[PDB]
Symmetry: C2
Subunit: 177 residues, 2 copies
Amino acid sequence: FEEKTIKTEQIFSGRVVKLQVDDVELPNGQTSKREIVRHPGAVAVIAITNENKIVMVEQYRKPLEKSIVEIPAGKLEKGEDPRVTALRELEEETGYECEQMEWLISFATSPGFADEIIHLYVAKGLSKKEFVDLIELTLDEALQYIKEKRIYDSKTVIAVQYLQLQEALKHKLEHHH
Amino acid sequence: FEEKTIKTEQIFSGRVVKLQVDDVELPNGQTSKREIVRHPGAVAVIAITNENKIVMVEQYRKPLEKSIVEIPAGKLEKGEDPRVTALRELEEETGYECEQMEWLISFATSPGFADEIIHLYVAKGLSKKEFVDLIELTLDEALQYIKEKRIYDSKTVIAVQYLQLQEALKHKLEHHH
């Protein structure tokens, strides 16, 4: 099943948001329009300190009219290596360097209207290389921020769940025959 | 910290996407613009059958140019009860009724430019009340769809992680003194 684009019209081209509408041909020969936001995507980092606290930053989010606590993340620049962007983000936003930075998962944030993709990485073995909006939380503190709706966006909820699973699964070992 | 809106201009008002730009006053008296997509939000359902399979639907997502496998979800209508919308979605999209439908968490999908909120519910005790794009997966099958990037959006990754945690934590019991 595929919706072939016959024509694209740009509605808006901003510093964050590009909006376009595609005239598309349905497999039945009917035609219709698809509103599409284009977004360069983002890299995000789950950084877990040697005290096992997850590193976070408080950001003001104008669309929500509130500040929320998030894992660090940066815009992916044109043709840039996401892992390189990830490492720049750890240092610039938290002032931490790591020993490893490894890709965990990639996902769309809202594929019903946007093509934005998040690339989620895990940084382990942190040490420092100033930071007013920097917050380090224990796992239990993070779960409490979720209860409080201070943590409140997809990618940060996924990171907290990941830390949770890493604790809950740390003895797992399957031996098949 | 707050960005007061001085004025709003509507750029576009569609069937899915509303785009506006706010002129806002920074706390320092500087001014700037914020591009904001308005979205009514969505309710989504984690439905776990009595065989412990999670219920999913394959959707074509034009912004990604591909079909992906997702938990069921529906637009929240103006002033509607999200739990009522959730239950309508279970029946209409999967043909399942449940015994309980309970709110798990709410979150923003991309708060850097959109106000879209997802309300995530869990349905337990399913029985049927036709479905070409309906898929039921074991937990291990779901993890494999993630490996394959067939599962590929925030809310479905959160649901899979939840099923994972529910298995991994099923013996937990803390007794404090």
